[PDB]
């Protein structure tokens, strides 16, 4: 019934490992693109 | 559609930025952002929680009935 | 006025490299964008795989 | 100067992924509008993929399946991807909605009512395409729902038959579910470009509900970055259910050959439609069922009307939060008695939270933002 | 100057094109090397199972 | 300060609190959805209440961005929330039913 | 008819120039190789060897 | 001048003991502040390479 | 509630507009008839009944 069996656990384990490595990289990419706006200070100075 | 320039009118307002690479991605990942997501967690538990614990006991009891009533009686 | 202009201070953010203010920051420029630069490069990498 | 802003085809690209102003502050909820049309193109490959090797005859239809699974290289992934595919798409859609309804995104009226015919093609094209494998399930699905217009007084059951093809679902069914399931996404595509083409007259709304005119960012790196961070976690969520658990959403009568002879005895839906089912067979009446049906989705494009409150979101409105997942588990409620066989207490329950449904949408909700109103003083 | 991602940067990132070059160098040598891993991880995870751990006993 | 109104006030001062939108160091009028009514109410609002309206909302969506709350010192004080646009408003709805009842007859 | 483009700035210009386009020709060179596992140029290569 | 992108700019070299503030100044209308430094930044390109 | 339209200036306006509506209703009524071929009506018609 399913002949793909032991070719889909070694995909399975392949993807596994590349997500493992892929998903904390691409989020630190973010996070070093936002920090320029998650630590920006704002400041309201009118004429009295 | 719209572009910058042209948006609103705004007075008297500083704004101070940093470079990316002067500062951390990650400075206070663990000592600050736990706290915070327990305040959050907090903030939200009783307009989230209720209904779904309403469907739990729903689901349970008529499960329950359930199975029971497909079990004969004597007589 | 703004003559009392002032920037905060960013001092919790900074990396180490940069949190003293009586040192040159052209020394460590090279490493922090060699760091930067080679985590964008693994994820390339992983992507074209 | 720039030429980016300047060349008559880059200005379309320029002031939609580009420049275009975005609020600040957006959260995850947002996304999802990127992933369904990342959805939408995955489904185009994979489902042009398996063209190449399908035959839409009554003779082969089910065989010409298990070659792709079998003998095709590869076969097997993209078939497993295009089933998948269109669970994933499902989940994305009601996601969609639901932010939509909690933010107050639904005073976009035309960017909403668009939606809602995106909302009813996909279920069409999503539809057909379970029709043709051919299973069991196929064959009664095509069956059943074909045959809710024979509740249309006076022309229903020659709508059924013109639909049919001939006096029973038969070869000629099957082909031109083939020849619509084909066609039907790219008119989808259409709409769905129709779809931003109202929305970036306003542009976004944000959490609060509030103008954010005055805190705007460029589209560009933030949410692009942004974009695609959760693009890779879609393709992290749908190669799990491919390469773990590929047969976990499906049904297993489909695996086996039509026959028109017998009915399963635990014939269901695909999960995604379970809800609308336990509204139908609530109602023990033909017609009444029909038109409950049809309004529990026609019912979005009456939310716009019923919006009392003074304010857009629901972030200040704590009522109308208590209310809004009682709607969700309400739903899900619908979903469970609509995967559960017709005994009681069943019956009962299910008849109790069709009638919570169309009272928490018609009724409640309203009431709450007007006491709402009230109790700010304005 | 010492520092091993000073070096990296001077030498590899600065410029686009080796930056590029040193991308499609990378995928070819990892590509190898972790196919060469992944595969040995699945074959001590199964060990004997497979086909290729028995079709010795019926081959001459 | 009787039976009934105590117990209103109370009701409302806890909802008040139960909205949360002090939190982020806003007034009940930043919040009111922009109709063309709101629009045009805003739009006749003086110099320095419509700039301390800017800064209040920018720095209500700079803390929402950064999902953080204002320190508890901070927050809108129930007592002290002025309702700096009810008057202009109600000025404008007067103004458009006074046209609408011109176009009945 | 393109004869403007000949004077001492363009062969400065093309001299600052032709080493970027080598090393994007090395890149689209090595892009195909990769790409299409050309057997021809990968067998000469020491650790890709083993692959085959 | 011929697109009227700003009324004036300068470039400026201010220098003090090890270090200094090299770069350009300009004043223009708020609809061309992204030609300008656009244009601006190019040509700093253009001399670096 | 659209309780804005309630005065003697729309009531006129739809005494004004009233046969128009009608013309159209007819217009929609009798095309529908004939795109159909609907027996029902169409029998009765005197010259149109010979073509069954
Ligand atoms: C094929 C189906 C659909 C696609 C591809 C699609 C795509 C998008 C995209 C890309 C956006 C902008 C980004 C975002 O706001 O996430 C958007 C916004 C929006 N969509 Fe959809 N959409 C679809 C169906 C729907 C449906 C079914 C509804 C509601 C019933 C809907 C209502 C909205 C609304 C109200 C917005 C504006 C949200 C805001 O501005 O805050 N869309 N859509
Ligand atoms: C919104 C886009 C689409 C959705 C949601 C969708 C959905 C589906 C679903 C749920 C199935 C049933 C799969 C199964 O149970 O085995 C299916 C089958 C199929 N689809 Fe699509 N589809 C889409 C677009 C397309 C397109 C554009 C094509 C071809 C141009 C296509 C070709 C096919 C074919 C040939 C099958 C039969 C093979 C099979 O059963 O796997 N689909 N589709
Ligand atoms: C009610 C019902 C359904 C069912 C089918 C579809 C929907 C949703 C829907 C509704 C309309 C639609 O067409 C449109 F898009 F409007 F053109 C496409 C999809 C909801 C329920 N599907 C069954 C499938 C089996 Cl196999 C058996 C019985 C049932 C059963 O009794």
Redesign the interface.
């Known amino acids: 019934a399913e002949?793909?069996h032991?070719h889909?656990?070694?995909?399975?384990?392949?993807?596994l490992?590349?997500?493992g490595?892929?998903?904390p990289?691409?989020?630190?990419?973010?996070?070093?693109?936002?920090?320029?706006?998650?630590?920006?200070?704002?400041?309201?100075?009118?004429?009295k | 559609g719209r572009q910058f320039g042209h948006l609103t009118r705004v007075?008297?307002?500083?704004?101070?930025?940093?470079?990316?690479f002067e500062?951390?991605?990650?400075p206070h990942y663990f000592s600050k952002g736990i706290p915070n997501v327990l305040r959050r967690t907090r903030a939200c538990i009783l307009r989230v929680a209720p209904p779904f614990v309403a469907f739990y006991l729903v689901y349970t009891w008529g499960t329950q009935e359930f199975e029971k009533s497909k079990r004969k009686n004597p007589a | 006025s703004h003559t009392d202009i002032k920037v905060?201070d960013?001092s919790d953010?900074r990396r180490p490299e940069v949190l003293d203010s009586t040192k040159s920051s052209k020394e460590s420029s090279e490493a922090r964008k060699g760091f930067?630069y080679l985590?964008?490069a693994?994820?390339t990498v992983?992507?074209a795989? | 100067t720039n030429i980016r802003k300047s060349h008559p085809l880059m200005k379309i690209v320029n002031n939609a992924f580009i420049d275009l102003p975005a609020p600040?502050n957006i959260s995850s909820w947002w996304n999802f509008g990127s992933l369904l049309g990342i959805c939408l193109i995955l489904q185009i490959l994979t489902g042009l993929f398996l063209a190449m090797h399908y035959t839409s005859d009554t003779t082969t239809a089910f065989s010409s399946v298990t070659h792709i699974?079998?003998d095709v290289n590869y076969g097997?992934?993209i078939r497993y991807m295009h089933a998948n595919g269109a669970s994933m798409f499902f989940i994305c859609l009601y996601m969609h909605v639901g932010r939509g309804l909690y933010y107050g995104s639904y005073t976009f009226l035309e960017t909403w009512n668009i939606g809602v015919i995106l909302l009813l093609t996909v279920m069409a094209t999503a539809f057909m395409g379970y029709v043709l494998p051919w299973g069991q399930m196929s064959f009664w699905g095509a069956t059943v729902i074909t045959n809710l217009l024979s509740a249309i007084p006076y022309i229903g059951t020659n709508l059924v038959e013109w639909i049919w093809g001939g006096f029973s679902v038969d070869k000629a069914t099957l082909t031109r579910f083939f020849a619509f399931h084909f066609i039907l996404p790219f008119i989808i595509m259409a709409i769905a470009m129709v779809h931003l083409l109202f929305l970036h007259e306003t542009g976004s709304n944000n959490p609060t509900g509030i103008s954010s005119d005055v805190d705007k960012?460029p589209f560009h790196?933030?949410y692009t970055?942004?974009d695609?961070?959760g693009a890779?976690?879609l393709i992290?969520a749908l190669?799990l259910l491919v390469?773990?658990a590929?047969d976990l959403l499906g049904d297993p009568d489909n695996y086996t050959p039509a026959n028109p002879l017998n009915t399963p005895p635990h014939i269901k839906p695909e999960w995604y439609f379970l809800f609308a089912y336990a509204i139908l067979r609530s109602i023990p009446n033909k017609l009444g069922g029909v038109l409950a049906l049809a309004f529990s989705i026609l019912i979005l494009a009456l939310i716009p009307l019923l919006h009392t409150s003074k304010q857009r979101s629901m972030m200040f409105r704590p009522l109308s939060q208590c209310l809004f997942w009682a709607l969700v588990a309400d739903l899900l409620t619908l979903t469970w008695i609509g995967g559960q066989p017709v005994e009681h207490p069943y019956i009962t329950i299910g008849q109790l939270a069709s009638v919570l449904y169309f009272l928490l949408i018609l009724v409640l909700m309203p009431t709450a933002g007007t006491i709402e109103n009230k109790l700010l003083k304005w | 100057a010492p520092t091993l991602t000073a070096r990296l940067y001077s030498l590899l990132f600065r410029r686009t094109s080796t930056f590029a070059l040193t991308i499609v160098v990378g995928a070819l040598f990892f590509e190898r090397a972790?196919?060469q891993g992944?595969?040995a991880?699945?074959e001590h995870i199964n060990e004997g199972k497979?086909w290729k751990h028995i079709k010795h006993k019926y081959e001459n | 300060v009787s039976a009934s109104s105590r117990w209103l006030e109370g009701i409302r001062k806890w909802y008040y609190n139960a909205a949360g939108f002090n939190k982020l160091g806003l007034m009940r009028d930043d919040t009111i959805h922009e109709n063309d009514d709101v629009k045009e109410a805003i739009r006749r609002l003086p110099e320095?209440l419509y700039?301390d309206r800017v800064?209040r909302i920018?720095?209500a969506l700079?803390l929402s961005?950064?999902q953080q709350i204002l320190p508890k010192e901070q927050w809108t004080k129930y007592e002290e929330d002025k309702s700096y646009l009810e008057p202009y408003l109600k000025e404008v709805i007067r103004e458009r039913k006074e046209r609408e009842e011109w176009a009945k007859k | 008819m393109l004869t403007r483009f000949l004077g001492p700035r363009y062969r400065q210009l093309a001299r600052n120039w032709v080493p970027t386009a080598s090393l994007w020709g090395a890149v689209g060179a090595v892009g195909l190789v990769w790409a299409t596992d050309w057997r021809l140029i990968l067998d000469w290569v020491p650790y890709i060897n083993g692959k085959f | 001048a011929t697109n009227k992108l700003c009324q004036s700019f300068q470039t400026f070299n201010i220098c003090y003991a090890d270090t200094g503030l090299l770069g350009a100044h300009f004043v223009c209308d708020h609809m061309s502040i992204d030609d300008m430094m656009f244009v601006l930044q190019g040509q700093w390109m253009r001399l670096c390479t």
Request: charged share 25%.
């Open positions: 002949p793909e032991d889909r656990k070694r995909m399975g384990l392949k993807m490992l590349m997500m490595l892929l998903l990289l691409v989020y630190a990419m973010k996070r070093h693109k936002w920090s320029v706006l998650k630590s920006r200070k704002l400041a309201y100075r009118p004429p | 007075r008297h307002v500083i704004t101070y930025s940093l470079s990316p500062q951390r991605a990650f | 905060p960013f953010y930067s985590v964008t693994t994820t992983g992507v795989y | 600040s699974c079998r097997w992934i960012i790196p933030y970055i942004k695609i961070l890779l976690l992290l190669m390469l773990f590929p | 972790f196919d992944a595969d991880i699945y497979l | 320095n700039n800064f920018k720095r700079d961005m950064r």
